[PDB]
Amino acid sequence: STNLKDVLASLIPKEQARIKTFRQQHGNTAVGQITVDMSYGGMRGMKGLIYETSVLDPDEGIRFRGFSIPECQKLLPKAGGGEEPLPEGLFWLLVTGQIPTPEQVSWVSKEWAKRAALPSHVVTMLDNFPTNLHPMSQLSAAITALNSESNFARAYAEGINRTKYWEFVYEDAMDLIAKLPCVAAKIYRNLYRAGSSIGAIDSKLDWSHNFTNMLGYTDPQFTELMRLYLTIHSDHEGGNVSAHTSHLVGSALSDPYLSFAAAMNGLAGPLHGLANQEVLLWLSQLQKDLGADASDEKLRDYIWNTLNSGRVVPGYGHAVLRKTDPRYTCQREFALKHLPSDPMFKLVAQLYKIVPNVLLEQGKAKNPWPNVDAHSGVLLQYYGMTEMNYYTVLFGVSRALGVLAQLIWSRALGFPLERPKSMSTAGLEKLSAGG
Amino acid sequence: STNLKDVLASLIPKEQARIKTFRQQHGNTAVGQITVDMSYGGMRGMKGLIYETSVLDPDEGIRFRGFSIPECQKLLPKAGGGEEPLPEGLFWLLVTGQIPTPEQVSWVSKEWAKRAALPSHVVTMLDNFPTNLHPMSQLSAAITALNSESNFARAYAEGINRTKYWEFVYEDAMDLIAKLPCVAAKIYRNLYRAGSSIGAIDSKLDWSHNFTNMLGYTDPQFTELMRLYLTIHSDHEGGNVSAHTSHLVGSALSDPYLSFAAAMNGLAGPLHGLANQEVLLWLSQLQKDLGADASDEKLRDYIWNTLNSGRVVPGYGHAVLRKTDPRYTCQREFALKHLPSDPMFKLVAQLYKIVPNVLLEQGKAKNPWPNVDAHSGVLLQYYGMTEMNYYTVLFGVSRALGVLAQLIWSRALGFPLERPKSMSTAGLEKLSAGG
Numbered sequence: 058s059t060n061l062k063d064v065l066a067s068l069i070p071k072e073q074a075r076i077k078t079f080r081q082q083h084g085n086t087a088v089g090q091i092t093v094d095m096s097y098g099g100m101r102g103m104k105g106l107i108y109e110t111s112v113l114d115p116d117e118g119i120r121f122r123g124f125s126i127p128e129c130q131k132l133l134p135k136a137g138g139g140e141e142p143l144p145e146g147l148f149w150l151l152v153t154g155q156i157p158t159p160e161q162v163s164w165v166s167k168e169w170a171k172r173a174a175l176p177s178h179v180v181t182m183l184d185n186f187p188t189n190l191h192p193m194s195q196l197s198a199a200i201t202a203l204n205s206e207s208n209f210a211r212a213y214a215e216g217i218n219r220t221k222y223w224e225f226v227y228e229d230a231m232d233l234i235a236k237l238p239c240v241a242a243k244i245y246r247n248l249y250r251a252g253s254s255i256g257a258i259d260s261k262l263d264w265s266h267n268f269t270n271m272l273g274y275t276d277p278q279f280t281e282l283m284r285l286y287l288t289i290h291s292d293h294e295g296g297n298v299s300a301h302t303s304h305l306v307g308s309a310l311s312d313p314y315l316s317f318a319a320a321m322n323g324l325a326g327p328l329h330g331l332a333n334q335e336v337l338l339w340l341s342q343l344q345k346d347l348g349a350d351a352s353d354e355k356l357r358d359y360i361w362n363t364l365n366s367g368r369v370v371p372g373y374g375h376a377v378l379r380k381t382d383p384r385y386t387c388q389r390e391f392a393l394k395h396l397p398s399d400p401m402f403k404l405v406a407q408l409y410k411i412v413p414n415v416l417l418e419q420g421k422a423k424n425p426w427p428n429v430d431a432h433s434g435v436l437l438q439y440y441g442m443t444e445m446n447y448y449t450v451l452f453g454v455s456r457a458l459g460v461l462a463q464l465i466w467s468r469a470l471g472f473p474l475e476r477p478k479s480m481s482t483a484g485l486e487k488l489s490a491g492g
Numbered sequence: 493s494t495n496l497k498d499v500l501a502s503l504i505p506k507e508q509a510r511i512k513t514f515r516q517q518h519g520n521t522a523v524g525q526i527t528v529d530m531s532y533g534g535m536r537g538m539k540g541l542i543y544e545t546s547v548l549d550p551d552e553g554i555r556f557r558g559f560s561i562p563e564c565q566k567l568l569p570k571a572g573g574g575e576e577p578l579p580e581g582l583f584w585l586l587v588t589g590q591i592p593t594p595e596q597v598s599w600v601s602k603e604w605a606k607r608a609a610l611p612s613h614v615v616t617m618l619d620n621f622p623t624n625l626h627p628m629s630q631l632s633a634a635i636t637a638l639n640s641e642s643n644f645a646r647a648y649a650e651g652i653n654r655t656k657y658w659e660f661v662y663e664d665a666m667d668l669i670a671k672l673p674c675v676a677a678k679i680y681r682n683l684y685r686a687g688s689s690i691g692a693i694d695s696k697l698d699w700s701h702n703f704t705n706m707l708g709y710t711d712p713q714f715t716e717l718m719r720l721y722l723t724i725h726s727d728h729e730g731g732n733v734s735a736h737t738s739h740l741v742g743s744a745l746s747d748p749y750l751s752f753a754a755a756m757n758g759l760a761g762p763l764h765g766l767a768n769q770e771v772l773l774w775l776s777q778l779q780k781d782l783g784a785d786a787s788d789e790k791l792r793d794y795i796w797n798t799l800n801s802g803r804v805v806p807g808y809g810h811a812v813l814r815k816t817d818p819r820y821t822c823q824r825e826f827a828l829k830h831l832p833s834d835p836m837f838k839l840v841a842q843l844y845k846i847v848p849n850v851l852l853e854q855g856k857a858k859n860p861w862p863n864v865d866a867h868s869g870v871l872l873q874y875y876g877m878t879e880m881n882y883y884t885v886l887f888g889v890s891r892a893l894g895v896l897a898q899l900i901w902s903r904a905l906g907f908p909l910e911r912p913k914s915m916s917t918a919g920l921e922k923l924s925a926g927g
């Protein structure tokens with residue numbers, strides 16, 4: 058009855074035509090200009106990609122297919138007795154552009170439970186990895202190793218016509234999303250619960266709930282946090298490091314497994330997703346140096362030392378946002394409702410009153426406001442997940458939803474190889490005159 | 493006496509200033525414009541990155557720090573009694589911009605022999621991988637797993653000042669290049685020479701020669717081919733999928749190991765480096781269907797069928813070149829000197845007279861000429877390396893030289909996070925009016 062694949066089959070040809078015509082009329086229209094500073098500056102401010110699933114406004118933050126976070130909270134189906142949106146529903150919205158029904162949502166949940174299964178070579182590999190290998194590296198290696206199972210890789214090798222690429226990318230996408238929590242939970246248990254098992258999938262629960270059970274958490278509020286977490290970290294337009302990496306690698310026709318693993322190596326960067334872990338380590342040194350209940354003057358001193366030592370203050374600033382991240386707000390709000398008296402929370406709250414000011418005073422950051430990473434780990438710590446080197450893995454699990462939803466569309470729309478032109482400083486000087 | 497690290501220490505501050513001033517004067521100068529078609533077209537034709545090591549001219553092909561392939565052949569140091577350039581020398585040129593002395597070259601060779609050593613967890617992992625796991629996937633997973641050894645990851649975690657990033661990236665770069673051939677050779681032996689050992693590094697040989705010995709090849713001409721192969725596949729400006737992926741991931745501060753593994757997942761794409769393998773599989777079906785000595789009319793038919801089935805003809809076309817790739821020419825020339833009567837070579841030569849014509853007739857490809865991938869495997873097959881699913885691994889090994897040479901410079905120059913702005917079709921329509 059419900060079948061996302063049949064819905065996409067109808068949607069595809071219509072978008073194809075729409076884009077065709079628009080390009081007929083405006084393909085040559087100029088949308089911007091490229092300056093020397095932009096090339097030197099990591100393409101800052103260059104409109105360079107088409108990415109359909111979400112769009113980020115510098116002032117307002119993220120919109121998923123046109124809806125803001127509050128809107129999603131309000132419109133997406135929730136679990137029975139739940140308050141937080143189910144990520145299954147978000148996935149539906151990203152892929153189709155339509156708010157799903159609860160019936161649609163449960164189908165997604167069953168599909169994902171049905172496809173969750175790991176091959177033994179992956180299991181062995183994880184089980185044989187050393188404990189000093191970072192969780193993200195263990196994750197990226199496992200997903201890379203899962204490509205032996207790719208249906209897209211296989212169909213390509215069989216010579217399938219390019220028009221059908223999307224159908225195979227869709228299947229690998231749904232298989233990958235299904236498997237992710239098992240890989241992630243296996244890493245968690247091996248490293249932190251040595252000798253225990255992740256157990257089995259219950260085809261009757263939502264994806265978030267089977268994940269938390271594999272992680273070994275019983276608290277129902279924890280289940281709720283995970284639903285919210287997994288929904289909000291899902292996508293953030295196409296230019297962010299991880300989504301752009303998946304997009305660029307996927308453009309070459311590498312399979313979804315290879316494309317997502319590469320993305321993961323981009324998310325593990327300190328300036329990207331690893332910031333969530335970096336925030337907790339910075340907070341821990343803080344409370345350690347200064348000891349728990351600090352004065353404002355002492356916090357400022359602490360921030361200045363970081364700055365003066367040639368380092369960044371993690372969880373603050375953004376390449377495109379210019380105001381406080383609604384993802385940060387959304388987390389604050391969860392904390393105020395559920396763990397208002399937590400001391401770490403209280404510390405994060407205090408920093409909100411100080412860090413921006415210090416950053417403004419320094420005068421280098423364009424955006425002195427916090428980003429999602431400044432508020433995430435604090436919530437996780439409260440429930441007992443104190444292993445901070447594992448936090449980025451949660452972000453990776455969520456990010457699969459967004460990048461994979463777009464990957465289907467990239468192939469459906471026939472986007473070609475991403476291949477811009479590069480320049481040397483010497484060549485660029487000549488192009489202009491020099492300086 | 494020779495110490496690349498000391499040479500870079502002098503070079504860095506001077507480039508830093510040069511770029512500073514130029515940007516002072518021309519930062520706001522416009523170098524191009526962005527159109528709708530470019531955003532939809534994988535940034536085709538957009539000048540979007542600064543990449544110092546090599547620059548590609550659409551007509552003339554690649555230049556490494558200003559030198560063309562023939563120039564390199566002629567200027568770079570060769571092995572005693574050799575004719576082909578040593579890749580060690582190319583690495584020196586890319587990193588410093590200067591042609592090295594043979595003495596400099598040997599230092600590079602010793603450094604690389606000294607640093608070649610694998611940790612046991614990597615060894616185990618490879619040894620436990622299944623034979624149906626693609627060689628590239630085995631490679632990318634191993635490099636990802638090697639990050640436990642990253643000196644950059646470690647220094648970052650210790651809070652090093654951003655000004656010293658390059659020094660740690662340099663060390664991981666030289667360690668990674670050193671280790672690559674051992675990882676690659678281990679994959680080769682496990683898959684195709686089960687029960688044998690790669691053996692040991694001889695600190696007295698060039699990198700290419702220790703690699704071929706680990707692969708188990710004795711032919712001296714094979715050693716020569718490998719030197720040439722590894723030199724020519726080294727770099728191809730910054731916008732190619734693999735180099736751009738390494739650049740983008742590295743921009744987030746992920747370590748060289750993570751950045752190169754991600755690049756490898758991009759090189760494994762059929763539209764990128766896997767084309768080398770794809771060419772040999774296409775040639776094998778050819779000679780199989782048509783049987784060895786084909787008529788021109790039969791070859792055309794064969795090409796048309798591929799085209800008509802919604803597939804690409806591998807080894808032809810390019811995102812930026814508009815003429816025959818000098819890398820292809822350079823290989824042809826090697827074949828004419830060493831294996832002129834090889835039947836497969838003869839087939840490749842015949843296709844040169846037909847494929848372009850067919851592509852032009854079809855009218856879709858912008859560049860109907862061959863690229864490097866159309867001539868590489870044929871040479872490898874001649875010497876006995878007939879395992880075509882492993883060819884891309886050789887390309888990866890070579891590509892480390894270029895991307896890693898630039899990675900050092902990216903951090904030395906303080907390039908920031910690569911983060912362009914994306915757009916949805918709907919948002920873009922509105923920006924203009926629609927169509």
Ligand SMILES: CC(C)(COP(=O)(O)OP(=O)(O)OC[C@H]1O[C@@H](n2cnc3c(N)ncnc32)[C@H](O)[C@@H]1OP(=O)(O)O)[C@@H](O)C(=O)NCCC(=O)NCCCC(N)=O
Pocket residue numbers: 101327328329330331332368369370371372373374375376377421422423424428429430906908909
């Ligand atoms: C996120 C980001 C990399 C954005 O980079 P950008 O767009 O290049 O930032 P920008 O235009 O404000 O940078 C201007 C200057 O301010 C500095 N600055 C910016 N944010 C800073 C921060 N939090 N702490 C210290 N310095 C900072 C920049 O590093 C740069 O200095 P430089 O000229 O000497 O290089 C940056 O704000 C940063 O480094 N933040 C800290 C790391 C972090 O929290 N990352 C997580 C982002 C969210 C996510 N998960 O991806």
Ligand SMILES: CC(C)(COP(=O)(O)OP(=O)(O)OC[C@H]1O[C@@H](n2cnc3c(N)ncnc32)[C@H](O)[C@@H]1OP(=O)(O)O)[C@@H](O)C(=O)NCCC(=O)NCCCC(N)=O
Pocket residue numbers: 471473474536762763764765766767803804805806807808809810811812856857858859863864865
């Ligand atoms: C290399 C490349 C992806 C360049 O892509 P591009 O810059 O998008 O190519 P383009 O502007 O000529 O494409 C225009 C049209 O011609 C088609 N075309 C281009 N090269 C083709 C080829 N070899 N066979 C069939 N069709 C081809 C394109 O796929 C496209 O058709 P579409 O409009 O229906 O999408 C393309 O030429 C190709 O697919 N080649 C075959 C694969 C290959 O040899 N890759 C190796 C490249 C070298 C390397 N190692 O990276």
Ligand SMILES: O=C([O-])CC(=O)C(=O)O
Pocket residue numbers: 292293296297298299376377428429911
């Ligand atoms: O938008 C970006 O550049 C980074 C970010 O916050 C995300 O990827 O979630």
Ligand SMILES: O=C([O-])CC(=O)C(=O)O
Pocket residue numbers: 476727728731732733734811812863864
């Ligand atoms: O230049 C490109 O886009 C691809 C290519 O030939 C290479 O990476 O060697």
